[PDB]
Amino acid sequence: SGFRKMAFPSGKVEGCMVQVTCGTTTLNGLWLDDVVYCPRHVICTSEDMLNPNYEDLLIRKSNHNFLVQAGNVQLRVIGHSMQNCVLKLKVDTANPKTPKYKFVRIQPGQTFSVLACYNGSPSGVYQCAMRPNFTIKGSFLNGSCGSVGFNIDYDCVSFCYMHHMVLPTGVHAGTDLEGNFYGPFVDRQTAQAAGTDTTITVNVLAWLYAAVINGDRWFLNRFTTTLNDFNLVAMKYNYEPLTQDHVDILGPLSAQTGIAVLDMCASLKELLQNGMNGRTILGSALLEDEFTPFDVVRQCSGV
Amino acid sequence: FRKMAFPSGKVEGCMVQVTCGTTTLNGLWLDDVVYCPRHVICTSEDMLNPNYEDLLIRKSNHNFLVQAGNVQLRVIGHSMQNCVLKLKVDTANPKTPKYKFVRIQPGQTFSVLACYNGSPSGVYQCAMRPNFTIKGSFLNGSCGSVGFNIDYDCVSFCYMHHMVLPTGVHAGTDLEGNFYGPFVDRQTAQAAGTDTTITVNVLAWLYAAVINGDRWFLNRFTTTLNDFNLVAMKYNYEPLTQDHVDILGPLSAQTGIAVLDMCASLKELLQNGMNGRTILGSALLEDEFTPFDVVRQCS
Ligand SMILES: *[C@@](O)(CO)[C@H](C[C@@H]1CCNC1=O)NC(=O)[C@H](CC(C)C)NC(=O)c1cc2c(OC)cccc2[nH]1
Ligand SMILES: *[C@@](O)(CO)[C@H](C[C@@H]1CCNC1=O)NC(=O)[C@H](CC(C)C)NC(=O)c1cc2c(OC)cccc2[nH]1
C-alpha cells in the first residue's frame, strides 16, 4: 500500500565516506579496500579550475599533499593515480567496513540512490534518475562533490555516480566510478548547457500503473493505440520513444492490473493532449518520470 | 526542492526480526532491549479481537524468537507498554547509537526505514498528517519499521508502524506504544478523520520560494494570528500554534518577512487563488516540508 520515492538504505555506503583535502580544496571521497576515490579537481586551486591541465597539475603533487580524514582518523596516502576525472589515493589502511561492491555505468532512464555528503559526513539520501540528456535532478550544495550514487542488490553495492558539477539550470552532472562523465560535460569551472531534456516515457507509464494499483483510474479511457501512433504523439511532446523492450518490461504491471500496455499508452496520449485539468495523480500535478518499472514492481507487487 | 531522508545507517544497525509462533515482524534493538508491536503475540485469528493482557499472560520469555539476521538473541524478560512489547535480551547492541524517544506533532517530518524480516529495504521521508496518518509505502511484513530524525549524532525515534487504513494510508505509534490518532491495533477497517493542509509547512515553503527569488505573492498586508486561523480553517488549513510561529522564526529573520505578513500573503493565495501563476515551479502549495527541512536543503 502506498507509493513513495524510496532510496536504498545508505549504511553500507556511509561506512565508506571520507574527506579529501588538497591545499584549500576539500570534498568527499569513497574509501573501498585500500583506495580512496574522489573527483580529481581536488588537486586544483581556484585559479586552476578555469582551465586545468590535470596531468600537468597532478605530476606536481606528492602523496603527502593529500590529507584524507576518516572521522577523527587521518589515513596515510602511499600512492596516487588518476583514471579520467577520478583520483585514486592508495592508503596504507584497508577500510574495514568495505561492502561487497561493483562499479557500473548506468543507462539513461535508470534510477539510483544518492548519499549527499559534506566534509566526508553523510547528510541525506534520495532517489534520482539518470535523465536522457545525462543530467540528474539532484539536491547538492557547496562541498557535495564526491558524493556517490548507487544501487544495492542483495548485499552488493553497485556504485554508478560520483558528483562533480551543477549546471546553470540547477541540474547536476557527474561521472561513473571510472571517471567518465555522463553527458557532454567537462570538469572545468565554466557554465555548461545540457542537451534537450526529454521525458522517460517507460517510467511515466510505470508510474501510471502504480497510480492504478493504488486505486486511482480517473485518467484511463476506453481507447487503444498502436505503438507507432503512440510514439508519434510522444515524440511531438519531447517524450522518448517506447520500444518493444519497454513494452515487455511493463508486462508484470500490465498483468497485475489487467491494463494492456498499449491501453495505458492511449491514456498517456490523452493526458498529453488534454493536460490534467487541475487533477493530480499520486498527489502530483505533473507526469512523473523518475520511477522505473522495477521501482513500481518492488513497491506495488501483490498489493 | 525534493524529499530527502536522513542517512539510515545508524538505524539499520538496530533492526531485528521478532517472531512468536508463525507471526513475524520487525523490532528495534537498543542497548539490551528490543521494542516491537505487541501484536506479534497474536495468531491471525487472535488479531480480530485481541485481549492483549490475556494473550500475554500465556507467553513466556522462551516463546519469543528475536534474530539479528539469522543470529538468535535470547530473550530474558518481557513487558507490555501500551501497544509495544519490550523484550530484554542477553546482548547489548554494539551498534546502539545515541538516541531518544520523542512524540511528534502533526506537520513534523521524519524518515522511515521500511524493513521486512528484520532486513532494511528502503528509506523515505514522511510527514505526520493532521489526521494522524502518514502516506507511507508499506507491504505485508513491514510492521515494526520505525521513523526517525537525526540531530547531530542522536537518533530521535518517533514512529513504529502498525496499521494500513482502508484508504491506503498508514497509522502507528510512538516508541512508548501510544498510537498517533484514534487508531487501535486490531484487524479491523478504521477510518481516519478528514485531513487538512499543514499551514506551518506551507508557510515554510513560501519562505523557501522567497529565499530563491520567487516572491510575486508577497503582499502589502498583515493580519493577526487569530484572524488568520479563523480564515485558514474555512479553507481546510490547520490553525497555527505559538510553536509554529516560533519555528518559523529563523526563516522570517533570514528573509526579513514577519511571520504574520507571510500569513497575510497566504490568506490572499487562499482567497484569490494563484491566477495561473506558479511558486517554485508548481501550481500546488507544498505542505510536507517543515521549516527545518527548508533550512536543511538550503544549507
Ligand atoms: C563540488 O563540491 C566542488 O568540489 C561542486 C558541487 C557544486 C557546488 C554547488 N552545487 C554543486 O553541485 N562542483 C563545482 O563547484 C564544479 C567544479 C568543477 C568540476 C571544476 N563547478 C561547477 O559546478 C560550476 C562552475 C560553474 C560556472 O562557472 C563559471 C558557471 C555556472 C555554473 C557552474 N557550475
Ligand atoms: C504489519 O506487518 C503486521 O504485523 C501489518 C502492516 C500492513 C500490511 C500491509 N501493509 C501494511 O502497512 N499490519 C497489519 O496487518 C495490521 C495488524 C493489526 C495491528 C493487528 N492490520 C491492518 O493494518 C489492517 C486490518 C484491516 C482490515 O481488517 C478487517 C480492514 C481494512 C484495513 C485493515 N488494515
Side-chain angles (χ1 to χ4, degrees), chain A residues 1-45 48-49 51-71 73-89 91-99 101 103-152 156-221 224-297 299-300 302-303, chain B residues 1-2 4-43 45-56 59-73 75-97 99-150 153-185 187-219 221-274 276-291 293-299:
Chain A
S1 23
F3 190 68
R4 300 295 320 293
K5 204 158 253 183
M6 199 180 296
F8 287 102
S10 61
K12 290 178 165 61
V13 183
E14 290 172 50
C16 303
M17 304 307 305
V18 299
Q19 181 173 194
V20 179
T21 292
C22 196
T24 63
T25 310
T26 285
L27 41 62
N28 307 280
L30 183 71
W31 179 25
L32 301 171
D33 293 318
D34 61 340
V35 179
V36 174
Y37 300 80
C38 71
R40 67 183 173 169
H41 68 262
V42 70
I43 72 184
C44 286
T45 88
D48 293 331
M49 294 179 179
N51 189 32
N53 199 324
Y54 281 111
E55 292 275 7
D56 209 46
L57 299 170
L58 183 56
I59 206 76
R60 315 189 184 240
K61 288 270 145 43
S62 307
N63 281 343
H64 78 266
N65 287 129
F66 295 105
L67 180 58
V68 181
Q69 301 153 224
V73 188
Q74 174 201 306
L75 307 169
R76 172 157 174 257
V77 175
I78 61 150
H80 64 272
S81 55
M82 170 160 74
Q83 180 175 6
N84 303 308
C85 304
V86 160
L87 179 58
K88 283 139 85 172
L89 303 176
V91 287
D92 73 338
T93 312
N95 178 4
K97 308 179 192 150
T98 307
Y101 75 96
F103 292 167
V104 308
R105 189 170 173 93
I106 205 93
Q107 300 297 327
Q110 286 316 288
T111 51
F112 55 101
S113 292
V114 169
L115 180 66
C117 297
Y118 301 89
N119 299 291
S121 291
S123 170
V125 71
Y126 52 89
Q127 218 202 24
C128 286
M130 177 51 71
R131 321 262 332 138
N133 72 355
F134 291 110
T135 66
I136 70 165
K137 307 164 155 192
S139 189
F140 291 118
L141 306 170
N142 283 352
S144 54
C145 288
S147 294
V148 296
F150 60 97
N151 282 285
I152 310 192
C156 186
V157 177
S158 290
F159 293 104
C160 61
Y161 178 86
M162 169 168 284
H163 183 50
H164 291 247
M165 305 260 310
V166 60
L167 308 193
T169 56
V171 301
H172 295 102
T175 66
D176 66 23
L177 268 297
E178 292 179 347
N180 295 301
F181 265 90
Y182 293 97
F185 310 108
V186 181
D187 49 341
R188 60 165 61 181
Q189 188 79 353
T190 63
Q192 296 173 52
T196 297
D197 191 354
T198 47
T199 299
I200 305 157
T201 306
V202 65
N203 285 9
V204 179
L205 293 166
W207 170 82
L208 291 178
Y209 279 110
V212 169
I213 291 168
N214 280 279
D216 206 350
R217 320 168 112 261
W218 72 256
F219 47 88
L220 304 177
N221 60 40
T224 202
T225 182
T226 63
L227 185 55
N228 184 73
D229 288 343
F230 169 76
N231 279 332
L232 280 176
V233 172
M235 297 190 285
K236 179 188 192 200
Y237 285 89
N238 237 15
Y239 274 53
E240 290 287 301
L242 191 74
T243 68
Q244 185 57 48
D245 289 357
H246 297 154
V247 169
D248 296 335
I249 283 153
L250 283 168
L253 296 172
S254 182
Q256 186 176 339
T257 55
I259 299 166
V261 171
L262 294 174
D263 293 348
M264 194 63 93
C265 287
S267 175
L268 178 49
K269 183 183 298 173
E270 182 161 41
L271 288 163
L272 291 178
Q273 287 171 351
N274 304 346
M276 283 162 68
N277 293 317
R279 312 201 47 151
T280 56
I281 300 172
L282 281 174
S284 177
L286 303 178
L287 298 177
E288 298 289 339
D289 78 335
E290 297 209 348
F291 301 83
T292 69
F294 185 52
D295 281 321
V296 176
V297 156
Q299 284 192 56
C300 298
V303 169
Chain B
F1 254 69
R2 81 153 39 232
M4 307 189 7
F6 287 99
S8 63
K10 286 173 172 61
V11 181
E12 286 166 59
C14 303
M15 305 299 317
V16 296
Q17 41 178 336
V18 182
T19 296
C20 182
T22 60
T23 304
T24 302
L25 42 60
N26 304 282
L28 181 73
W29 181 18
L30 300 168
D31 292 319
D32 62 344
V33 180
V34 170
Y35 306 77
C36 73
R38 65 178 174 172
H39 71 261
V40 69
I41 69 182
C42 296
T43 67
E45 190 65 22
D46 285 337
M47 310 163 182
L48 282 317
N49 183 32
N51 182 326
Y52 284 108
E53 295 77 14
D54 280 14
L55 292 179
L56 193 58
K59 300 293 185 204
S60 314
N61 293 326
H62 64 79
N63 296 131
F64 293 97
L65 178 54
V66 174
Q67 299 166 292
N70 276 337
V71 178
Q72 175 181 11
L73 306 172
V75 174
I76 62 177
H78 61 284
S79 58
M80 208 165 44
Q81 180 177 13
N82 302 309
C83 300
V84 287
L85 191 70
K86 296 190 293 200
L87 304 173
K88 190 174 271 303
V89 290
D90 71 349
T91 306
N93 187 358
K95 291 175 183 309
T96 300
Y99 76 92
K100 41 191 217 153
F101 289 171
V102 309
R103 183 176 182 76
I104 59 172
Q105 286 303 105
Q108 290 195 252
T109 54
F110 53 99
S111 296
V112 169
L113 179 64
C115 295
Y116 297 92
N117 311 293
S119 193
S121 175
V123 62
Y124 55 89
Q125 181 219 254
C126 268
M128 181 62 68
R129 303 307 304 180
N131 71 355
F132 300 109
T133 64
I134 63 172
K135 288 95 154 83
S137 175
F138 285 127
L139 297 170
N140 283 334
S142 60
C143 286
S145 300
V146 297
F148 59 97
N149 283 276
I150 302 180
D153 56 328
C154 185
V155 175
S156 287
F157 297 102
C158 59
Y159 179 86
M160 177 161 284
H161 183 52
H162 295 246
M163 296 292 289
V164 58
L165 305 194
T167 54
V169 298
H170 299 101
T173 66
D174 65 18
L175 268 292
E176 298 179 327
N178 289 126
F179 263 90
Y180 293 97
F183 310 112
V184 295
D185 44 348
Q187 188 74 5
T188 72
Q190 296 168 55
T194 73
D195 205 16
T196 51
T197 300
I198 305 158
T199 307
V200 62
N201 289 359
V202 173
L203 295 169
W205 178 253
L206 297 175
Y207 277 110
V210 169
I211 286 161
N212 289 286
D214 200 357
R215 55 177 185 267
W216 60 264
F217 48 88
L218 294 178
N219 70 21
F221 327 104
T222 196
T223 182
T224 63
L225 193 58
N226 185 239
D227 190 64
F228 174 77
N229 279 358
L230 296 172
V231 178
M233 280 198 324
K234 295 161 168 211
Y235 291 84
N236 213 52
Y237 266 63
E238 275 307 291
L240 295 171
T241 67
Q242 184 59 42
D243 288 350
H244 291 154
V245 172
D246 295 339
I247 61 168
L248 286 164
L251 288 171
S252 179
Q254 182 181 345
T255 58
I257 307 301
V259 173
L260 289 169
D261 292 5
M262 187 67 85
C263 286
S265 289
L266 177 55
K267 176 182 307 183
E268 202 197 311
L269 290 175
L270 298 182
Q271 292 183 318
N272 296 134
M274 305 267 305
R277 282 192 100 161
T278 51
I279 295 172
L280 287 167
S282 173
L284 306 189
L285 290 177
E286 169 65 50
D287 80 339
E288 287 215 344
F289 291 96
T290 68
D293 305 318
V294 163
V295 153
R296 146 174 205 246
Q297 270 181 62
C298 292
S299 43

